[PDB]
Symmetry: C2
Subunit: 607 residues, 2 copies
């Protein structure tokens, strides 16, 4: 039982999970032609299958701003950043976005070790195509040397965040994401790590990728994107970067951290010798799924939704369908009781983030309680009949209803179970079993009042970043519709789950409307505000320093907390003063929430 206490991502036409969700429920065929900032793209297109490598050319889901980074925040020289793989940059940002989303600080994330925390990292990437431009430059002359070593994607993270867990870069075609997750799951149980960060990353930045995808007949003619049925003959590659934080279920509930889902079980295997290379074997696809449900102790009849590998390949869908049918008929003979879909029909095909993207899709459905429509499945493949299969492709947004079923003379309501598959070209296979987490009993009894008001605090590396955080906080308070009960939690996450910066701003609040108004106060240009405590740390260094370097003086601050002089503490906190926010409430710390993460700059860096 592995809980997920965090998630984030960037995907084509989506800077956030929320943005991704809106396109999802908006059913946006979010795939477009190649932007001009990348290769010229007019050199190789020929609309014909002849030696040009293109003719499957202007179809790919792309994430806006691939060459945008904020190195100073990460203590990286502009010279160094300019030659670091963008893949490394994008994964590095998401993890910190992931950590921030979970409401944990790099210095307090599994920090129960005394020297940095025992945190394992696993990243799935297929190939790095950024050193290639070095080869072209060397061929054309000059001198330039960019190294690959996709381990740099993980090592840099373990480097910056000071982690003491294993850090590796696993690699299985189109299935790294689930292989990376699977390994992370087992390490936690054995006790090698307390908290882990799996993921995937993939960005298409060199035309050679498109060339090979045509020379091999893996492309999708001129079709817009993957079509789960009705004569699909290929896939459209796409970009994606994502991360997910894992923690054992008992601990997460103990720390109270918000739980997106539960990974009950997983499995992996390989088909073996088949009638040719890159030909999936249903028999393996049966076994890996079968073992997965066994390890989880999940009965297939209780399943509700499964995400399929999709890819819209002509010789991949019927094989996938037969295997899923085969392993399911062992326990139940019923039909049309589970829904099947794929995210690739929206974002193209990642080949390394497909697993996390599929994983991310499930969690949002599990969060919003709404199965999302698929796309391009109006007609379905004529080859295979879904009447006999237990799976019907989703066509419209619908409430994701809770399962109630009678098995062996017993009617019960089980939870919302889902499964996911990722089948790689090489032959490697993987699958996961997830379940929603039910809260037994827990509620914040709106302790906020004038006696004990809310203490909201933000911070950023400068004012420009600070002002944006205010704006994004206001919109999130609006778009997500938070209430007076959330205030304590909103303050709490903003207190510990955000790392103290140089530019700081704080307010004392009792009500949501009060917080909305005051933040709107700051956004307007006023040098003076009522009970809006602003400040910095660039100036006050020694005077704030000597404060903590004293026990008698520390006693005074503890006295303030006792006396409730919240005005003075913030008046000093904005200047640099640091104190434990746990000191405010000595027991029953509130729950965390997902709040918008640090708004990283968009400075550009390219060769």
């Amino acid at each position: 039982d592995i809980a997920i206490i965090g998630i984030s991502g960037r995907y084509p036409q989506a800077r956030n999970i929320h943005d991704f969700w809106k396109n999802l429920r908006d059913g946006k065929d979010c795939i477009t032609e190649i932007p001009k900032d990348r290769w010229d793209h007019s050199l190789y297109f020929d609309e014909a299958k002849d030696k040009l490598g293109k003719s499957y050319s202007k179809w790919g889901g792309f994430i806006d701003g691939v060459d945008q980074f904020d190195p100073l925040f990460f203590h990286i020289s502009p010279r160094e950043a300019e030659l670091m793989d963008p893949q490394e940059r994008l994964f590095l940002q998401c993890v910190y976005e992931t950590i921030e989303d979970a409401g944990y600080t790099r210095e307090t994330l599994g920090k129960h070790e005394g020297l940095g925390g025992n945190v394992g990292v696993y990243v799935g990437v297929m190939y790095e195509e950024y050193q290639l431009y070095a080869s072209a430059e060397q061929a054309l002359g000059r001198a330039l040397a960019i190294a690959g070593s996709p381990a740099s994607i993980a090592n840099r993270v373990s480097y910056f965040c000071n982690f003491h867990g294993p850090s590796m870069a696993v690699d299985t075609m189109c299935s790294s994401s689930l292989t990376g997750i699977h390994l992370a799951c087992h390490s936690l149980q054995r006790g090698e790590c307390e908290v882990a960060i799996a993921g995937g990353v993939n960005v298409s930045i060199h035309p050679n990728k498109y060339l090979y995808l045509s020379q091999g007949k893996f492309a999708s003619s001129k079709g817009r994107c993957e079509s789960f049925g009705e004569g699909g003959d290929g896939y459209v590659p796409g970009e994606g970067v994502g991360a997910v934080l894992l923690k054992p279920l008992a601990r997460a509930i103990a720390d109270g951290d918000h739980i997106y889902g539960v990974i009950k079980g997983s499995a992996i295997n390989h088909g073996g010798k088949t009638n040719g290379y890159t030909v999936p074997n249903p028999h393996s696809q049966s076994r890996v799924i079968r073992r997965a449900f066994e390890e989880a102790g999940i009965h297939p009849r209780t399943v509700s939704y499964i995400e399929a590998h999709g890819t819209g390949t002509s010789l991949g869908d019927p094989i996938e369908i037969a295997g899923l049918t085969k392993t399911f008929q062992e326990y139940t003979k019923e039909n049309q009781f589970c829904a099947i879909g794929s995210a690739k029909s929206n974002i193209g095909h990642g080949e390394s983030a497909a697993g996390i993207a599929g994983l991310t899709k499930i969690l949002l459905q599990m969060k919003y309680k709404r199965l999302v429509p698929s796309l391009h499945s109006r007609t379905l493949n004529p080859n295979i009949d879904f009447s006999k299969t237990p799976f019907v492709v989703q066509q419209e947004l619908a409430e994701w209803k809770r399962p109630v079923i009678e098995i062996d003379g017993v009617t019960r309501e089980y939870a919302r179970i889902a499964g996911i598959s990722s089948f790689g070209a090489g032959g490697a296979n993987a699958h996961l079993v997830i379940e929603e987490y039910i809260e037994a009993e827990h509620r914040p009894p709106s302790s906020i009042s004038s006696k004990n008001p809310a203490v909201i605090v933000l911070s950023a590396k400068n004012k420009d970043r600070l002002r944006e955080q205010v704006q994004r906080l206001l919109s999130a308070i609006r778009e997500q519709v938070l209430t007076d009960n959330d205030l304590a939690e909103i303050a709490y996450t903003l207190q510990v789950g955000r790392e103290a910066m140089e530019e700081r701003f704080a307010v004392i609040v009792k009500s949501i409307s009060e917080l909305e108004a005051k933040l709107t106060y700051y956004l307007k240009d006023e040098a003076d505000s009522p009970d809006l405590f602003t400040g910095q740390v660039k100036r006050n260094k020694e005077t704030m320093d000597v404060f903590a370097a004293d026990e008698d003086l520390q006693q005074a601050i503890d006295t303030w907390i006792t006396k409730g002089k919240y005005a003075k503490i913030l008046q000093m906190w904005v200047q640099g003063l640091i104190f434990d926010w746990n000191k405010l409430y000595g027991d029953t710390k509130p729950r965390r929430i997902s709040l918008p993460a640090y708004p990283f700059a968009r400075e550009r860096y390219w060769l």
Copy 2:
């Protein structure tokens, strides 16, 4: 070529072990349950393709080191896990360690760990 040498190396090992591809952990009825792990740092064999493309013509060599192990699984017909881990200068031990636990958990009956590296660019 990394694929070629490793594939030959595995077959030499199986014979060297005194087991045949059709009997090595073959106690499954359909091929045997054998896991494969390989450690590789990077592939520099596609760089020639990019160099050629810059100079003209048209040539596309792909990387995806997962081929290094899958081809081994493909040719020898193994049904156990197959991956290509990568830790700088420490892939080989990482691959071994993972195989060690998988045997402990019962996923595989036999394992094949290793590493490969060649300087060609």
